[PDB]
Amino acid sequence: RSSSFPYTT
Amino acid sequence: RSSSFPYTT
Amino acid sequence: GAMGSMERASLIQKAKLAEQAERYEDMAAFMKGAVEKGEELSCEERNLLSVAYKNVVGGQRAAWRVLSSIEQKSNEEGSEEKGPEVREYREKVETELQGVCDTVLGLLDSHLIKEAGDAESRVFYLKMKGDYYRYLAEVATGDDKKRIIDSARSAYQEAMDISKKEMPPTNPIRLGLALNFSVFHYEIANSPEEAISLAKTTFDEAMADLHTLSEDSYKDSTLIMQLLRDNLTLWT
Amino acid sequence: GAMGSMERASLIQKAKLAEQAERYEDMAAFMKGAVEKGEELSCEERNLLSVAYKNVVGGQRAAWRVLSSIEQKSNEEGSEEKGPEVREYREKVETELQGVCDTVLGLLDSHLIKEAGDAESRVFYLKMKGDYYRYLAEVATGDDKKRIIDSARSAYQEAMDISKKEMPPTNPIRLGLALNFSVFHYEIANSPEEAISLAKTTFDEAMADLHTLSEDSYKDSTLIMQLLRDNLTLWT
Ligand SMILES: [Ca+2]
Ligand SMILES: [Ca+2]
Ligand SMILES: [Ca+2]
Ligand SMILES: [Ca+2]
Ligand SMILES: [Ca+2]
Ligand SMILES: [Ca+2]
Ligand SMILES: [Ca+2]
Ligand SMILES: [Ca+2]
Ligand SMILES: [Ca+2]
Ligand SMILES: [Ca+2]
Ligand SMILES: [Cl-]
Ligand SMILES: [Cl-]
């Protein structure tokens, strides 16, 4: 569950 | 915003 | 159509996978394929059909309402003219929505309803017919608006008549039918008093029959009864 | 294609409407049409393109992960054989995902990247190239997996090189690029130490430049910096 950008709701 | 059945998330 | 070469059981299996993946357009296409095999649907299969199309049309209805609101604001006084684009795109979404409703109504007419002899199946399909005519009525503005409304009313009424004769007041299909028919009265037919009366009577007759139910059936029925209560609170 | 008869400005207007309606497939189709008019994209238009396709591919990636998990469980010991359906449907979603990635990469190659001369536009498009190769790498298993990975790496690296030369450390495009390249290292390239090092260095160099920014720019940069921190917390 890594965070990337952009992201969705 | 009346409630009906079935419904979505 | 495109699902003609796939086994019925494989279509049902893939509909369940599509649901888990939240791929509701796929789910609906698989269930349409299953219906077109020509065999009657089991209770579980009927629920898969309903869930699939409810999610598809739900996305379209929500989008339509957003665009309709923008369009209506554009036709106010002092609103700057921004060309045909809002109307065009609202019309695009509307046409797609009408296409989905027509697809569902087509499945019901060819030949789900005529083959449905048990109360549970017949009421389920007539409720669906009412619902999808109701969604058509939400976007209707032309000559045929009155006929669309009457088609929804007629389907709901036939379903109500069977359900009252053949099902207990706590049956979830009966409850969901009455809920949705009450919403029809309030939102489509300009009959808020009828909507409230139906919701009240339905709730009260269900309350009086809860004592007959198992714990699991009690949970199923009270969930829908809460929706009746939620509407009554909003409407009164 | 289908958008060839619609004005560029009308396509952009409808992309914004589609976003408001949460109709991301439509939004992406409108933006593809706008790109195919052949003019360069403004900053706002580049963001519309990115948002549209990120939402489309996001739905596909989430679905693919659900189905892949079910498939992997099916190939465990003691798991009952249930036929080809899970694999088939995973493959269907995978092919659709690959199609979207190929569409985006096609737009970038014909001819967004070659026409992009300003650092902000060039880095934006090279980041996008890295991202969509990364999404292809997530589902790749065959001979070409190593080449797909290297294509993502190469695009990210070119973007990094330009961004370091031409943009401040707090630039949101630079920050989002570094964030996503660090995710590439961790999730695709089996290089968790490189991922952590990049995230740390990026965060620290941004922290030191925040003092130069307005309140609004500060908000934009710190939002992405928090994502770097969130990953560092997960990874260490
Ligand atoms: Ca993520
Ligand atoms: Ca509702
Ligand atoms: Ca067969
Ligand atoms: Ca129309
Ligand atoms: Ca009975
Ligand atoms: Ca009254
Ligand atoms: Ca023109
Ligand atoms: Ca494949
Ligand atoms: Ca600069
Ligand atoms: Ca170490
Ligand atoms: Cl349109
Ligand atoms: Cl399939």
Numbering used by the authors:
A (entry chain B), B (entry chain B): 410 to 418
C (entry chain A), D (entry chain A): 1 to 236
Provide the authors' original text about this structure.
These ‘central hub’ proteins hold a key role in cellular signaling networks, as they are known to interact with over 1200 protein clients, and are involved in pathways related to metabolism, apoptosis, cell signaling and tumor development. Protein interaction with 14-3-3 can yield a multitude of effects,8e.g., the structural stabilization of the client protein, the masking of functional sequences, or bringing two proteins together.
Our model was applied to identify novel putative binding sites on biologically relevant 14-3-3 client proteins (FOXO3, Myc, BAD, Notch-4, CFTR and p53). The model was used to screen 296 potential binding sites and to select eight peptide sequences for follow-up assays. Experimental validation confirmed the predictive power of our model, with three out of eight newly predicted phosphopeptides exhibiting low-micromolar binding affinities to 14-3-3, two weak binders and two binders with marginal affinity. Structural characterization via X-ray crystallography further substantiated our findings, revealing binding modes consistent with known 14-3-3-client interactions. The identification of such structurally representative 14-3-3 binding motifs, without having provided such structural information to our models, testifies to the strength of our deep learning approach.
